[PDB]
Design a protein around this ligand. Structure first.
Ligand SMILES: *C(=O)CCCCCCCCCCCCCCC
Ligand SMILES: OC[C@H]1O[C@H](O)[C@@H](O)[C@@H](O)[C@@H]1O
Lengths: 56, 517
């Protein structure tokens, strides 16, 4: 999903990107006796203030 | 048993076909002031005020980034801070083992009077520091200069943390002490544990500040290093002259400094579930100056009349040279040395098949001018054009004779002070045999500019950049300075190579040749 498009250049698939991200993983949870089956997203990593570029 | 020599009949043997002689060449040496230099990766920093009778007074400050040993900590429920102590170990050596355990230490690397006192102020920095920053497609490094004291001083929040007025030895009357801080704990079921700690800088910081900054802070601010460093930007150390007392400066290793916060939480409980409390401790370590670029040494110097006049651009002659060379560490000055005379005759030296036995540069100290001031223990000569060590430095693998003296290594290369019977410096001799040999042996080699500057350790051969490069000549620049020079706060005065200087004290290159005939 592209919420907003930048006003600059675009990095290559092998270039370094200076960005902040918040990741979460999707895991289907088994339907329990009292709770029905659903999807849950658990947080694992986040970088609010980037310091070094990440090689893509 | 016929391996002994004798001195009978030497006149009967014929003469050899080589002539061992020495030649003297003039050198062009002038002074070059060192403007704001990079103080971001200095292994050792200075904190205090040093008053030099000849060079002047220098004030050294320090700014560093703080970090947590373990991020995303579990402080506990209902935390109550008990104490916040900052400890920075001092360079000290045990001098006399005493009875009843304990020890007696003597502070090392302390410059200035032993009775000096300074007004120490520890503030919370409000200026975010970074090690690198993206640019127009490149990741450039971040540099903090010695002249950025105003930027860090203006962006400081609140008042000094060391605000315990009950102890004036930690603020307004601070002095580098040498106590052993004896501690006894009867926690061994009743038995005591007499534990001793080497001399260190112990300061009691505002407990209320750390209560809400860490113990009562949102978990989103101490989850990682990036967020924490943005929250707690760092610590700023400011020094001022104490009321009615001299000032001294000391070189410290802030990489081992840390502030431990001792508090009491409600314990994991759930078994007894009472209002009981447990003792907990969190450590806020200071960032490492070598592994991080979030540390700067703010060095401000009040150059004296003589020193400022000699290094001024109006009193420097780049054609003939300077009669006196003022080389000082830190944000001081250096000397540009050019072997123009040798280069002019280099064509004839290589045509006569002459070989170089040894080449040396002897710098004579001006004892009359350099009186009453501490003298540097060693000087360093490098290549100013390529900003790399000379070939002689790498070719010398000698180690200091004294065991454990890594600072006196490479004695063949030179640079060590030659003290006289009066315990005062007399001269510095540097051997550049390999550099001269390459010039005559290799025709494509070019005579590069040489720079002389004080050095703290011969091992540290890295270089620090200047905020603004200086234009020595049309296409010649002075952009970097040895890193070991910034750490040394001392300086020395040497005789220049001007033709007006007496031949016995004038600086000149002496080359010993093996003239084959
Ligand atoms: C210092 O030079 C001390 C004298 C060296 C040793 C003397 C003995 C030399 C042995 C020579 C043997 C020659 C051959 C013997 C039979 C063929
Ligand atoms: O000996 C520790 C200390 O000694 C002096 C300098 O060489 C510093 O760079 C070093 O950190």
């Amino acid at each position: 999903l592209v919420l907003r498009e930048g006003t600059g250049t675009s990095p290559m698939n092998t270039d370094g990107a200076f960005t902040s991200y918040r990741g979460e993983y999707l895991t289907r949870v088994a339907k329990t006796d009292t709770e029905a089956e659903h999807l849950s997203t658990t947080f694992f990593e986040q970088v609010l203030f980037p310091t070094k570029a990440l090689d893509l | 048993c016929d391996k002994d020599f004798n001195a009978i009949g030497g006149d009967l043997i014929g003469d050899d076909h080589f002539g061992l002689e020495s030649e003297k060449y003039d050198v062009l040496s002038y002074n070059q002031e060192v403007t704001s230099v990079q103080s971001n990766v200095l292994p050792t920093s200075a904190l205090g005020i040093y008053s030099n009778p000849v060079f002047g007074e220098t004030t050294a400050n320090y700014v560093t980034q703080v970090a947590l040993v373990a991020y995303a900590p579990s402080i506990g429920e209902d935390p109550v801070i008990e104490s916040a102590v900052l400890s920075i170990p001092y360079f000290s050596h045990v001098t006399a083992n005493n009875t009843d355990g304990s020890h007696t230490y003597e502070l090392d690397s302390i410059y200035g009077p032993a009775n000096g006192k300074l007004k120490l102020s520890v503030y919370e920095s409000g200026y975010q520091m970074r090690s690198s920053f993206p640019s127009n497609g490149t990741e450039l490094p971040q540099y903090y200069y010695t002249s950025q004291n105003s930027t860090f001083d203006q962006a400081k929040v609140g008042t000094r943390l060391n605000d315990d007025l009950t102890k004036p030895f930690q603020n307004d009357q601070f002095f580098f002490s040498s106590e052993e801080y004896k501690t006894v704990t009867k926690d061994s079921n009743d038995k005591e544990t007499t534990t001793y700690t080497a001399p260190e800088m112990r300061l009691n910081l505002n407990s209320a500040f750390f209560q809400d900054k860490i113990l009562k802070a949102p978990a989103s601010k101490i989850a990682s290093t990036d967020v924490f460093q943005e929250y707690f930007r760092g610590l700023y150390f400011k020094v001022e002259k104490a009321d009615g007392s001299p000032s001294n400066m000391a070189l410290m290793d802030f990489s081992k400094g840390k502030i431990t916060i001792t508090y009491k939480a409600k314990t994991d409980i759930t078994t007894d579930a009472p209002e009981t409390t447990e003792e907990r401790t969190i450590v806020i370590n200071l960032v490492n100056p070598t592994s991080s670029g979030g540390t700067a040494n703010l060095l401000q110097d009040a150059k004296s009349a003589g020193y400022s006049g000699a290094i001024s651009s109006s009193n420097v002659n780049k054609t003939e040279g300077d009669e006196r060379l003022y080389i000082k560490g830190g944000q001081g000055s250096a000397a540009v040395i050019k072997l123009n005379d040798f280069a002019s005759k280099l064509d004839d030296i290589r045509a006569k098949n002459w070989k170089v036995n040894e080449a040396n540069l002897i710098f004579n100290i001006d004892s009359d001018l350099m009186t009453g001031a501490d003298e540097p223990k060693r000087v360093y000569l490098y290549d100013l054009t390529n900003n790399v060590p000379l070939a002689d430095y790498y070719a010398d693998q000698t180690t200091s004779l004294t065991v454990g003296d890594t600072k006196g290594a490479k004695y063949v290369f030179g640079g060590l002070i030659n003290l006289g019977d009066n315990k005062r410096g007399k001269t510095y001799k540097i051997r550049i045999t390999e550099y001269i040999r390459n010039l005559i042996k290799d025709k494509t080699a070019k005579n590069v500019n040489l720079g002389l500057v004080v050095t703290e350790s011969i091992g540290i051969t890295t270089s620090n950049f200047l905020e603004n490069r200086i234009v020595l000549q049309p296409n010649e620049y002075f952009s970097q300075v040895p890193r070991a020079s910034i750490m040394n706060p001392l300086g020395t005065i040497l005789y220049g190579g001007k033709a007006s200087v007496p031949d016995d004290k004038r600086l000149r290159l002496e080359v010993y040749y093996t003239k084959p005939n």
